[PDB]
Amino acid sequence: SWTSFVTPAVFEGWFPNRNPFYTYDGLVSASNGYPEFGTTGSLDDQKRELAAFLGNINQASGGLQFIQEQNPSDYCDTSSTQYPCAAGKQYYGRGPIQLSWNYNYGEAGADLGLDLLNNPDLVAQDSTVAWRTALWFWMKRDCHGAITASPPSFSGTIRIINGGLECNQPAGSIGNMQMENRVTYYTQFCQTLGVDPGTDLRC
Ligand SMILES: CC(=O)N[C@@H]1[C@@H](O)[C@H](O[C@@H]2O[C@H](CO)[C@@H](O[C@@H]3O[C@H](CO)[C@@H](O[C@@H]4O[C@H](CO)[C@@H](O)[C@H](O)[C@H]4NC(C)=O)[C@H](O)[C@H]3NC(C)=O)[C@H](O)[C@H]2NC(C)=O)[C@@H](CO)O[C@H]1O
């Protein structure tokens, strides 16, 4: 199990100022529904996966300090018709991965058997839902495949999560700085775990 190397102590050291909504036990329990997460490839692939998932989360959530996007749009994309927006509801970032947009809440809701499309606030109000959405995105959108491949691709995870805004950005621009922070956190977490992060890092 990945919990053999990401212990409670490792997690707490990485996220010492987390909002109490987010717990190690919550992550562990939710991860049980994604048995391939953190158990795919070599031990070093498992370590890179955890570092990549949690490094991206560190960026998105501000060290797990935030549940909701700070100072958010309602993130209703009316061109995206498969998952209809609910009147008055807002699809701004929520949970560890800052799940955003009707299309993501809708697809996650369908896959998870949860009322996320009509009640997106569940992601900020139920920590089991919050962790499940982060793992859902990681697995369904195939950040998992990017990082656990030989060779690993951390850059691929950034592209999938927020590539339009963070990849292919001028050096030093806000999106580029966000991207570089993800890389910094990933590499720091890899250092904790004693694993080489690989070379395919930035986008
Ligand atoms: C310089 C620096 O690093 N500053 C930090 C702040 O960036 C940070 O605030 C958080 O910032 C991130 C951007 O890095 C922001 O991320 C939002 O994340 C969601 C989820 O990934 C994105 O949604 C994606 O949208 C695309 C389409 O554009 C979809 O294709 C994709 O499916 C979506 N992904 C998911 C998982 O749903 C948003 O696009 C993205 N927003 C922007 C503007 O880039 C977070 O919401 C910010 N977090 C908070 C809590 O507000 C801040 C955190 O405290 O810390 C600074 O240091």
Residues 97, 71: Cα–Cα separation, whole Å: 17
Domain end, chosen from 91, 106, 125, is at 125
- Measured by CA distance, the residue closest to atom 55 of ligand 1 is 62
Q: Which atom of ligand 1 is the closest one to the Cα of 70?
A: 51
- The residues facing 68 across adjacent strands are 94
Q: How remote is the CA of residue 38 from the centroid of ligand 1, in Å?
A: 24
Alpha-carbon torsion (117, 121, 123, 128), positive or negative: negative
- Measured by CA distance, the residue closest to atom 24 of ligand 1 is 162
Residues 6, 116: Cα–Cα separation, whole Å: 29
Residues 6+ apart with CB under 8 A from 86: 117, 118, 119, 120
Q: Which atom of ligand 1 is the closest one to the Cα of 69?
A: 51
Residues 85, 77: Cα–Cα separation, whole Å: 8
Same domain? 121 vs 133? no
Same domain? 145 vs 164? yes
Q: In this structure, what CATH number is given to the domain that contains residue 85?
A: 3.30.20.10
